[model samples]
Target: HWGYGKHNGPEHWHKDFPIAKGERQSPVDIDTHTAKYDPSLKPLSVSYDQATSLRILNNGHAFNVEFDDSQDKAVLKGGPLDGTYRLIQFHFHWGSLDGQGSEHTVDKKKYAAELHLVHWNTKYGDFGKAVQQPDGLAVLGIFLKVGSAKPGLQKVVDVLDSIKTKGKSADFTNFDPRGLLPESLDYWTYPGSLTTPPLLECVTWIVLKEPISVSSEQVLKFRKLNFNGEGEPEELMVDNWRPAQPLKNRQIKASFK
Candidate 1:
């Protein structure tokens, strides 16, 4: 029922989901100067099995690369986390134009787009259970800068044709998600919520300082996907991003000074 339009955009989300206005909301602007360096934080550990990448789908909001997370075959741990969080899915958000699209900005600088690797804490049993607790989910945010064409991300873009309409899905296996990450893991982290509606205040956000690249032509392909089901009036799924939220009183910690 909610979409990124005049009537159902981010500003109007608080009407249906009270927590949208709650503390710990996500996609905050990361002011490097204000971020504190924490020595206690360990290097993050990420391990994924290509076999775990199961399917890809267009869920109307954005497309998601779903993974087989019945167990901890692919997971994230260490940095700012006390337990292993199983990888479940990954998605992207972008604007209609290249100038702005990313949900989180660095020092007020906006990127062409953003990527989210969503994981759920095993300590909470599963995603449905984990999504409601304060420490339930951890989302890795990677900004997409427009430059060279990223063949890694292109593997995903190539398949967009298969799932052009909402509710469309295709078998997508053996794709390594690590290909989409920048070499540097140095990041700014804070406690925050999902950027979308239902806006549950439960995610531990780890946004990488370095961004991956995608050519302007590559990002244009994302606009070709429709936000509606077949036979419905089609709406291009461009600018499917929430703006930066208030940081509240939380401390944003950085792995680097």
Candidate 2:
């Protein structure tokens, strides 16, 4: 998401998701130049029909979702996973221009946008309380690139009309983000901070190396948000992405088995 050019995004998120921001963060540069092969983290696969209960929401800052794990249709089966992880929410970070919207950059190369699906350790019984602990959260980050038309994005863009204003929100129905997961689950993980306000540092980051692509038209609709209106109605919310932040002595590790 584009801000007033500076001092307006996650760098200041410490004011919002304050307690949550204390967890992990996003927007790091990740590339193959330094990518190491990891085998410990196994693959996670989900069928389209299995994600039916997935619900979408818009909190003004970004589009997100909260899934029901207890629902029979939303089960997360085994795949070398430590435990069953419930689908929490799906959100993103973007830049202003075509190639400037990514939150994680590898070797200073940013993409179009980044999507994060937040999950929690069911062992704790609650996501809200679990996210506060260092190991309480698990987020899978999917990168978005500008190119090739994307049919998957329509699930989100189709609801833009209802949430056009700042602080405006709408409920989404029958949306399954699992359909958005790229074919490759190969990922690089680490302990990092949140890329939004009140930047939290308690999350375990699972950053995927490969990015998914969408058409320019898909990106255009996102850029169409009303940023300026009569009498400061809502700040130009064209871009909802944050720039890559300093990695700060953080080491991104692979799930090497």
Candidate 3:
């Protein structure tokens, strides 16, 4: 029942989901200067099958591209991971404003938005079970900047019009998510939790240094989505990102210096 609204925002999450105040919470500010460079971190190995994409849904929180993760059709390996992680879904978080939307920040600088590619480890069977373990999930965080138009993002933006209201869904397939990533795989890795509740401390965060481009026009379209469901007064679904959490005793590892 947690939402981005004033009454049930991130500040009130800990009231219900106790882990929301946990030490290993997500969406931390990444300070490159303090991050330790690790030569041992391997290059990310991403293999995605277009057919694995099932549908797109607006769950009143954010739009997510769900996948048929029943099998390892789309999987992520390497890059500080011990075993394969199955791609479950992908989503975004943004603000109504232009320069202050992303969950994770770099040196306290926020981006226009952020893209999260969520995966769960195969060791725990399904996503439902894996999310409870210490090393059960891994999320790839790609920062979105406002600049030139991105042709790769057009496909995703095109469908937003149809699924404008909450709880609406449409079939979407044959879209390779890899095309949406930046050229550089260099990243900062750390241990964190789910940004949303029940904010479990089970995620291994892989945040890319290079941000991909998105036009101003595209960002405006993203702001049009409604958080409340059909037949309700429109509540614009913007600023759905959580604020940065404490780093605790964790050390972020950089893939490249």
Cα lDDT tens digits, model 2, 152-257, are 7786876766656554556666776766778777678777655665455656677776788987887776765544433445554546766665565666665442
Task: Report lDDT (Cα) of residue 205, candidate 1.
Answer: 97
Question: What are the runs in model 2 whose C-alpha is more than 4 Å off?
Answer: 1-7, 13-25, 45-49, 52-55, 69-81, 226-232, 255-257
- Candidate 1 lDDT over residue span 20-87, tens digit each: 88989988999999999999888888887543899999999999999999987889998999899999
Positional deviation of residue 6's Cα in model 2 after best superposition, in angstroms: 4.4
lDDT of 1: 0.92
Distance from true location, Cα of 182 in model 2, Å: 1.6
**Residue 110 lDDT, candidate 3, scale 0-100:** 98
Tell me the TM-score of model 3. 0.98
Query: Residue 200 deviation, candidate 1, in Å?
Result: 0.4
Candidate-wise lDDT, in order: 0.92, 0.63, 0.93
